Amino acid sequence: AKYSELEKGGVIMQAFYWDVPSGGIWWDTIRQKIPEWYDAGISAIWIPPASKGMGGAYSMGYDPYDFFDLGEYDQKGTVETRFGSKQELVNMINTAHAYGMKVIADIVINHRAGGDLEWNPFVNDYTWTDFSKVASGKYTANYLDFHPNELHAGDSGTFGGYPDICHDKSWDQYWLWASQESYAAYLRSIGIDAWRFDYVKGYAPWVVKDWLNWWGGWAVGEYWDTNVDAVLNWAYSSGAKVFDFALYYKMDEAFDNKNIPALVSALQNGQTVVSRDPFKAVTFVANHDTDIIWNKYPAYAFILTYEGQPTIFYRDYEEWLNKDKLKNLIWIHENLAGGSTDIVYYDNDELIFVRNGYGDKPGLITYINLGSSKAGRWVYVPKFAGACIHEYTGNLGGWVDKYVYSSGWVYLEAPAYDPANGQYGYSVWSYCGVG
Numbered sequence: 001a002k003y004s005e006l007e008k009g010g011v012i013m014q015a016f017y018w019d020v021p022s023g024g025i026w027w028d029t030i031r032q033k034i035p036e037w038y039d040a041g042i043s044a045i046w047i048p049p050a051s052k053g054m055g056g057a058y059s060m061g062y063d064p065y066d067f068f069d070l071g072e073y074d075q076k077g078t079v080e081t082r083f084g085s086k087q088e089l090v091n092m093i094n095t096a097h098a099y100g101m102k103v104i105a106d107i108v109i110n111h112r113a114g115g116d117l118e119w120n121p122f123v124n125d126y127t128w129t130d131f132s133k134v135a136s137g138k139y140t141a142n143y144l145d146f147h148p149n150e151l152h153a154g155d156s157g158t159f160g161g162y163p164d165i166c167h168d169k170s171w172d173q174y175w176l177w178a179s180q181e182s183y184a185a186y187l188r189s190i191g192i193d194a195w196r197f198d199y200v201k202g203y204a205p206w207v208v209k210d211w212l213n214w215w216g217g218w219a220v221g222e223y224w225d226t227n228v229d230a231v232l233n234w235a236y237s238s239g240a241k242v243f244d245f246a247l248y249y250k251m252d253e254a255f256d257n258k259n260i261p262a263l264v265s266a267l268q269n270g271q272t273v274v275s276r277d278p279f280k281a282v283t284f285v286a287n288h289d290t291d292i293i294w295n296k297y298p299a300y301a302f303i304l305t306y307e308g309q310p311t312i313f314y315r316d317y318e319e320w321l322n323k324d325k326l327k328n329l330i331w332i333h334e335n336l337a338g339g340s341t342d343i344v345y346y347d348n349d350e351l352i353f354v355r356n357g358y359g360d361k362p363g364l365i366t367y368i369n370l371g372s373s374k375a376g377r378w379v380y381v382p383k384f385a386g387a388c389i390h391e392y393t394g395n396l397g398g399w400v401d402k403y404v405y406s407s408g409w410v411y412l413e414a415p416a417y418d419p420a421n422g423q424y425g426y427s428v429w430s431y432c433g434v435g
């Protein structure tokens with residue numbers, strides 16, 4: 001990749017959103033975007049589930065039917081998945097790899113859908129658990145492979161009305177990851193580097209742990225909970241990273257309501273994943289399931305300058321926000337951001353913090369202003385004592401340097417928040433002459 005790799009905390013692009021254009025053109029669409037994402041500093045792409053789903057040509061992938069049909073068997077009324085053919089998928093992966101970018105597959109293994117009806121002794125009724133017809137001929141299944149069964153009635157959670165998979169059955173382990181013939185092995189064989197596990201609240205962390213024992217690779221789990229204790233417990237149990245939903249709702253509370261103290265308080269009190277373990281937190285401003293933050297500029301300024309591993313939402317980058325402003329923030333993340341963090345000042349509409357630097361990365365000062373007027377303030381930032389500092393976004397109207405006195409004091413400024421008029425409500429500073 002152009003800067004940091006995925007394994008080194010590099011920026012991730014979520015390469016989709018809910019109900020992307022059907023017509024089997026999305027792998028190709030993504031493939032065409034990657035040279036640009038590369039130039040932008042993106043380290044890896046998270047793609048939607050690739051298998052043939054119950055919904056066939058219009059499935060978003062979260063109702064998997066034939067795990068080993070990546071869009072090449074005529075099934076569920078289509079050959080290709082919503083996103084394209086197996087060949088197109090392979091092509092995109094190959095392109096990604098030509099640009100030193102990694103591909104993170106979306107793994108949906110809580111449940112399955114589109115099975116035929118069959119008598120189920122354990123339920124004393126009929127269930128849609130007959131998967132004998134799968135065209136790949138791999139990982140057929142029946143009622144024994146779902147809950148409830150002879151082993152037990154159920155597990156930590158279910159999703160939709162979809163048959164709920166019993167990972168405790170040898171057959172299911174073998175086919176999903178525990179063999180050279182498994183679904184994991186198959187993805188890995190076509191170049192999948194890394195993993196995003198869907199709805200990990202639905203089954204035990206040992207599943208993900210054993211998957212990673214077999215296959216390795218960077219991994220994140222979607223554990224949708226604001227309870228940081230429960231999220232991290234799962235992260236440490238599974239060995240995987242976790243999406244920071246806690247931060248997400250806190251950024252909404254703060255940036256959409258001029259209530260920055262709600263964010264600061266959550267950071268200080270360990271009520272975000274990132275402020276408790278920045279090596280586990282995968283941060284984001286929106287995803288395909290939820291998009292409640294209207295005030296995205298400060299939210300992106302935050303996650304691209306603060307600790308953690310940030311994700312860019314496809315729609316935000318490609319449609320809704322100023323792409324060049326995001327490229328800039330990605331540049332800042334990869335060239336300046338590093339080190340521990342100190343909050344320098346905050347109130348209802350202002351947030352200033354310093355990153356103290358680490359390795360090659362000098363560190364930085366971020367200044368978020370939610371107010372409708374330009375903001376300026378004396379702040380004590382001893383990290384930069386006696387140094388020329390330069391503003392790296394251009395948000396103050398051009399080239400701006402300032403001098404941090406030996407005393408540690410500087411008069412820092414941030415533009416008004418008024419995006420309609422090119423005023424984006426943040427400035428970012430570091431030593432002069434970095435790049």
Ligand SMILES: OC[C@H]1O[C@@H]2O[C@H]3[C@H](O)[C@@H](O)[C@@H](O[C@H]4[C@H](O)[C@@H](O)[C@@H](O[C@H]5[C@@H](O)[C@@H](O)[C@@H](O[C@H]6[C@H](O)[C@@H](O)[C@@H](O[C@H]7[C@H](O)[C@@H](O)[C@@H](O[C@H]8[C@H](O)[C@@H](O)[C@@H](O[C@H]1[C@H](O)[C@H]2O)O[C@@H]8CO)O[C@@H]7CO)O[C@@H]6CO)O[C@@H]5CO)O[C@@H]4CO)O[C@@H]3CO
Binds near residue numbers: 008280309338339357
């Ligand atoms: O540089 C990449 C990075 O940038 C961000 O990280 C910053 C933090 O957010 C910020 O708080 C500060 O980190 C400090 C930290 O919070 C303190 O607790 C302390 O760290 C101690 C201590 O916690 C202790 O455990 C030990 O650390 C050891 C490990 O225990 C050991 O296993 C190994 O660590 C490796 C990992 O285990 C691998 O997973 C791997 O990690 C990477 C991440 O997963 C990743 O997302 C990314 O990190 C960024 C992060 O998300 C940002 O928020 O890149 C990774 C690095 O390649 O690889 C490593 C290394 O081989 O070894 C380490 C020590 O090197 O001892 C600690 C102190 O040495 O102190 C700090 C530092 O101030 O600063 C950073 C860095 O910018």
Ligand SMILES: OC[C@H]1O[C@@](CO)(O[C@H]2O[C@H](CO)[C@@H](O)[C@H](O)[C@H]2O)[C@@H](O)[C@@H]1O
Binds near residue numbers: 069180186
């Ligand atoms: O278990 C999947 C595994 O089988 C291999 C060959 O050993 O590929 C076969 O199965 C794939 C999935 O249905 C087919 O697409 C492929 O054409 C077929 O040879 C491995 O490639 C794969 O990992």
Ligand SMILES: OC[C@H]1O[C@@](CO)(O[C@H]2O[C@H](CO)[C@@H](O)[C@H](O)[C@H]2O)[C@@H](O)[C@@H]1O
Binds near residue numbers: 216219238239279
């Ligand atoms: O790193 C190899 C190996 O370590 C595990 C934990 O067993 O994951 C750790 O390392 C990852 C990459 O550095 C981190 O992202 C992860 O959070 C951490 O637990 C395995 O998953 C991985 O195969």
Ligand SMILES: [Ca+2]
Binds near residue numbers: 023025080085
């Ligand atoms: Ca196609």
Ligand SMILES: [Ca+2]
Binds near residue numbers: 158202203
């Ligand atoms: Ca389940």
Ligand SMILES: [Ca+2]
Binds near residue numbers: 292
């Ligand atoms: Ca909101």
Ligand SMILES: [Ca+2]
Binds near residue numbers: 347349
């Ligand atoms: Ca104020």
Ligand SMILES: [Zn+2]
Binds near residue numbers: 151166167
């Ligand atoms: Zn079970």
